[PDB]
Paper text:
Here, we present crystal structures of [name] from Isatis indigotica and pinoresinol reductases (PrRs) AtPrR1 and AtPrR2 from Arabidopsis thaliana, in the apo, substrate-bound and product-bound states. The crystal structures were captured in the apo, substrate-bound and/or product-bound forms. We found that, for all 16 structures we solved, each enzyme adopts a similar head-to-tail dimer conformation, strongly suggesting that each PLR/PrR functions as a homodimer, consistent with the literature that TpPLR1 exists as a dimeric entity in solution. Each structure contains a head-to-tail homodimer, and the catalytic pocket comprises structural elements from both monomers. β4 loop covers the top of the pocket, and residue 98 from the loop governs catalytic specificity.
Regarding the mechanism of the second catalytic step, we further compared the structures of [name]_NAP_ + PIN, [name]_NAP_-LAR and [name]_NAP_-SEC, which revealed a similar mode for substrate/product binding.
Numbering used by the authors:
A (entry chain A): 8 to 91, 97 to 130, 142 to 263, 272 to 317
B (entry chain C): 7 to 91, 97 to 130, 142 to 262, 271 to 317
Write the structure that this text describes.
């Protein structure tokens, strides 16, 4: 009855939320348990905390091809959320899935900028498609913790107190999404017959905002005007890949420059998800 | 009387995060030290702000800014620190601040392990607390169950071994294994208990005083399988590196159990309503 899901990378930022979202959806949830690399107290405790919620642990190693095959044979769907070298370990996962033969869908570690735009992620896609593994690519949003809570400033995760850099004129549309919402959309789409072999864009409508609109949401919550320093494009390219990431998002507008139909956008596919709006998101910092 | 306001220092540490939640559970108005970011540290930031949803307040302060420590402690009645273990010695700056503010009714320094006065920068911190005249409680005497029980006291891992296990000496030295949650709850109960002002509190839940070989047997009965044991002489063990030695005092010298403690200084008796987790329940999560 339940879809059986294996979550790969279950102790990461996105992966842990995907574990929880799969359980909250009612999926029978399995989490890949990799051989310890270190005395890692919070890693181990996070993993075992999942059992208390009803998840099961499956031990396997990426260096052990047969242990991966044994793992994926126990589930119906695989979701990966590796850090993004670590993206490429999914190639081992693809061969294991291809050998196993029983996987109905694979969602690789995407959850960001679409890599098919004119990349290790694209190499994983090709292997998936070469093997004929049904897939769903979840893309198109900035994690609110990495880009909204710091008003998109680099090198920090919390609002600045007095000053703020604005990229260009800060009128390039961006997509700011609470990581919990991304995970819940992921749990809902992964067995949806409508999203088989599709790209799903996480673009909740009211969270499509320019940097300046984000800052102005904050300024209205606090009642304080920030001192703004506009940084021109070339002023931003003083760098001789993470500056590259910001440049594509805030200068090239790579998240919002192509329109998406309702049949491929998460908030339209799953309108019951009451996604967190950025004014609510930012309240925790007041 | 009223809440009793507590500032937790090291609030995103292993022990500190449990202490934050314990203080909220006990009904204290709970404040957490927000230190300036040293890096893009997503899980550290999310942990800190998760406390707000639970009713805690954050106070930004820096150890390198004496005036920010003063201001932070001036907003609370009690201070509890749980720094990793230099980390220890930064508490000296905190004592100077506590000294100047002059409103702190009690300070619990970062202890929660072997009593150093029976073996240290912890002792240095004690000396400063006492020289300054700051009322104190020292919480000592227990092995964290995550570091010593879930691995059956094996080094280099935190989960039960699959078939063989090392026995230190004869595995008949008494050790104290306690759930970190219980340590934190005892800490939140004791920090304003008049019976423990200016005392050492020993966390020694009676049913959790166990030999390594007893711990192993609890697990063998849970799994129904016996484990291949190999014993290891003190001298062998000591064949030449501070983690080792922590273990040696604990499992060879028996430093946690070689002295008696009285009920008016033992947490499980001071706080008998804390139904502490026994090791047979603790280990079940691993099955
Ligand atoms: N704004 C946005 O849209 C963002 C996009 N992303 C993307 O989301 C996806 C997940 O990112 P994130 O949550 O930050 O990932 P994490 O950095 O949190 O790592 C997650 C897990 O990946 C496993 N892992 C990492 N390296 C290796 C390795 N060499 N070998 C084996 N396993 C490894 C580990 O799994 P285990 O739990 O088993 O130990 C680790 O816990 C990525 O594709 C990333 O590009 C992430 C940041 C922001
Ligand atoms: N078996 C046992 O009984 C055990 C005993 N202990 C003892 O418990 C106490 C706390 O240990 P534990 O919870 O594991 O420690 P942690 O390593 O988990 O504590 C980390 C926190 O302490 C702060 N910290 C660390 N270094 C610094 C620094 N240079 N400057 C400022 N802050 C710093 C940070 O505070 P912030 O959150 O604000 O960023 C950090 O988050 C210690 O006294 C330890 O000796 C701990 C392990 C096992
Ligand atoms: C907030 O300050 C920073 C934030 C980051 C976040 C990095 C941002 O680019 C992020 C990212 C990676 C992959 C993506 O597909 C992605 O899509 C938005 C974003 C990185 C996530 O770790 C990097 C450097 C910083 O200084
Ligand atoms: C579980 O494997 C290890 C576990 C540790 C735990 C270290 C154990 O000695 C612990 C300790 C530190 C301070 C203490 O006061 C203490 O009292 C028991 C124990 C250390 C806590 O970080 C160290 C090395 C290991 O290989």
């Amino acid at each position: 009855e339940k879809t059986r899901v294996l979550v790969v990378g279950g102790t990461g930022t996105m992966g842990r939320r995907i574990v929880r979202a799969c359980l909250a959806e009612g999926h029978e949830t399995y989490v890949l348990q990799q051989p310890e690399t270190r005395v890692d107290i919070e890693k181990v405790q996070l993993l075992y905390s999942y059992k208390r919620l009803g998840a099961r642990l499956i031990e396997a190693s990426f260096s052990d091809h047969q242990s991966l095959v044994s793992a994926v044979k126990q589930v119906d769907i695989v979701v990966a959320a590796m850090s993004g070298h670590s993206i490429l370990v999914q190639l081992k996962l693809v061969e294991a899935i291809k050998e196993a033969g029983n996987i109905k869908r694979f969602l690789p570690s995407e959850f960001g900028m679409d890599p098919s735009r004119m990349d290790q992620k694209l190499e994983v896609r090709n292997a998936i498609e070469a093997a004929g593994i049904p897939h769903t690519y979840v893309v198109g949003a900035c994690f609110a913790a990495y880009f909204a809570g710091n008003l998109s400033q680099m090198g920090t995760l919390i609002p600045p107190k007095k000053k703020v850099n604005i990229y260009g004129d800060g009128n390039v549309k961006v997509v700011y999404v609470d990581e919990d919402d991304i995970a819940e959309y992921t749990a809902k789409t992964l067995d949806d017959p409508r999203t088989i072999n599709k790209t799903v864009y996480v673009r909740p409508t009211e969270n499509v905002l320019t940097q300046m609109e984000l800052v102005q949401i904050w300024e209205k919550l606090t009642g304080k005007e920030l001192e703004k320093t506009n940084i021109s494009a070339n002023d931003f390219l003083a760098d001789i890949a993470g500056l590259g990431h910001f440049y594509h998002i805030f200068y090239e507008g790579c998240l919002t420059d192509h329109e998406v139909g309702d049949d491929e956008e998460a908030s339209k596919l799953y309108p019951d998800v009451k996604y967190t709006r950025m004014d609510e998101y930012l309240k925790i910092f007041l």
